Each structure stands twice: as C-alpha cells, then as structure tokens.
C-alpha cells in the first residue's frame, strides 16, 4: 500500500529531551503516542524503499 | 406461536379488531405476571402472544392495502404509496418511446434507405 506506514502526522521532538530525533507520534491517551514514526527502522512504520507495482 | 394464518384470514373486519382487543389485553396481564414472579410457562405465553399481535396486524394491513390498490388501479392520480417501485433516477429518465423519437424527415429516410443485407464474393 502506497500509504502504508506514512499514515501519521508525526514530527521529531528535537534535541534537549534525552530521546533520539526519530519522528514521534502526536497526542496522548494511548501507548502509541510518543512512539516511533515513519522511519524504516521503527515499528509500524514504512519499510525500506517500498515495492511498487510498476 | 399458536394463532395460525388460516384462522386469521377467515375472520371478518370487525372480528379482526375484536380479536386484537383481546390479544392486547391478554398480553397486558402477562406483562404483570412477569413482574409479579410468574412461572416460566406464563413467560413462554408472553412471547407467543406478541407474535400473534404482529401476525394479526400484518394480515389487517395487507388486506386493506390490497383493496386500496384495486381502488386506484384505474385512477388518473395515484398516491405515491401505490406507484410502481422505481429509483429517483428512473422516474426522471425519458421513456423508451421518447428516447427513440425521430423527426419525420429522418424517419422516412430510414424506411427508404435502410441497412440492406449483403456479402462479398472472395
């Protein structure tokens, strides 16, 4: 799916917070918030260059 | 469920409503029996009568609606509840006759120069 993994509105928290600069999910109230984002090394993100049907 | 459709269909118009008065009253006392600690046999009777009321009403409405359709079958102005079943789009599209209308000049040409049948020798 062309939208797989990239269906979030995540931005990196920056520096100064003792956490890595990988983008992080936004909001609160769930365990998903504050977790990793699109990057291919994370969980539930996109993979390396995704397979294309063409 | 013990009312039978044959018994209902043979009833008169007044016997339709006369039975319904008793059936509603019978269920009304059965609702009290559920509240006041009734036996399971009385509870099973509650479920039966409810379907009897539904069964009785279905025949009452169908018979009257069928009579209504026979009333307005010849009527020029028919109520929307008796018009043929169609989607909103279908009732807006032109009829098959109107879609195939031809001008007199074009209609007469199709009768003088129609598509002839033929073949070619190889």
């Amino acid at each position: 799916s062309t939208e797989a993994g990239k269906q979030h509105s995540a931005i990196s928290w920056g520096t100064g917070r003792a956490v890595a600069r990988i983008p992080r999910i936004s909001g609160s109230g769930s365990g998903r918030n504050g977790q990793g984002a699109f990057g291919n090394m994370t969980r539930k993100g996109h993979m390396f260059s995704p397979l294309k049907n063409f | 469920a013990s009312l039978k459709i044959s018994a209902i269909k043979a009833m008169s118009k007044n016997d339709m409503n006369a039975k319904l008065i008793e059936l509603k009253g019978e269920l009304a006392n059965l609702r009290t029996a559920k509240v006041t600690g009734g036996a399971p046999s009385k509870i099973s009777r509650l479920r039966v009568v409810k379907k009897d009321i539904a069964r009785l009403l279905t025949v009452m409405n169908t018979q009257r609606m069928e009579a209504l359709r026979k009333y307005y079958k010849q009527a020029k102005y028919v109520p929307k509840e008796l018009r043929p079943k169609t989607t909103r789009k279908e009732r807006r599209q032109l009829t098959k006759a109107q879609l195939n209308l031809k001008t007199v000049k074009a209609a007469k040409k199709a009768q003088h120069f129609p598509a002839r049948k033929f073949f070619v020798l190889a």
Binding site: F54 | P114, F118, F119, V120
Partner: protein, 92 residues
C-alpha cells in the same frame, strides 16, 4: 554525456501501466466476433478508397482513405444515397 531527465515533476502519479493489455485483446476480439453474429457484414469494414500519402517522403505509397468522392460514385454509376447502405464509405 549531459543528462536530460524530466523526472523533477511528480512522475509517480503520471505512471500508466499496461496490465490491462492482455485483457484488452480478449475484449476487442469478443466484440468483433459478436458483431458479425448480429449481422455478418456489420464488421465488414465498409470499402475505402486507394489514396496516396502526403509529402514527397511517402507520395509513392498507396493507402486506404475514408469514403469515395461524389465524382467517383458518379463515374462508377453508384447512387450516393444507396452507397452507405451497401457497405461503401462516402466522403463528400
């Protein structure tokens, strides 16, 4: 060699894939077959003239055109109103 690639625009939404090409052959063929079954000379591909190509590059090659001129039908003694009904293309 100096490269000239017009991929700076969004080509991924400009990509057209021909996966329907094998099924296009079956669809078109089943229409020609089912057209003759209606009336066999329906797909007879009504007769077309033998016209020259344009430009000096192709001027010596003959190819099919569309429709005979009204002078060609008169030279061959054919009614122009009846020509279209017997599988003859006409181009006034």
């Amino acid at each position: 060699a100096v490269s000239n690639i017009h991929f700076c625009k969004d080509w991924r939404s400009k990509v057209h894939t021909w996966f329907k090409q094998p099924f296009r052959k079956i669809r078109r063929h089943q229409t020609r077959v089912e057209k003759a079954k209606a009336v066999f000379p329906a797909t007879i591909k009504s007769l077309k003239p033998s016209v020259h190509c344009m430009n000096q590059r192709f001027n010596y090659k003959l190819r099919l055109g569309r429709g005979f001129t009204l002078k060609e039908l008169r030279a061959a003694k054919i009614d122009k109103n009846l020509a279209r009904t017997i599988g003859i293309a006409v181009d006034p």
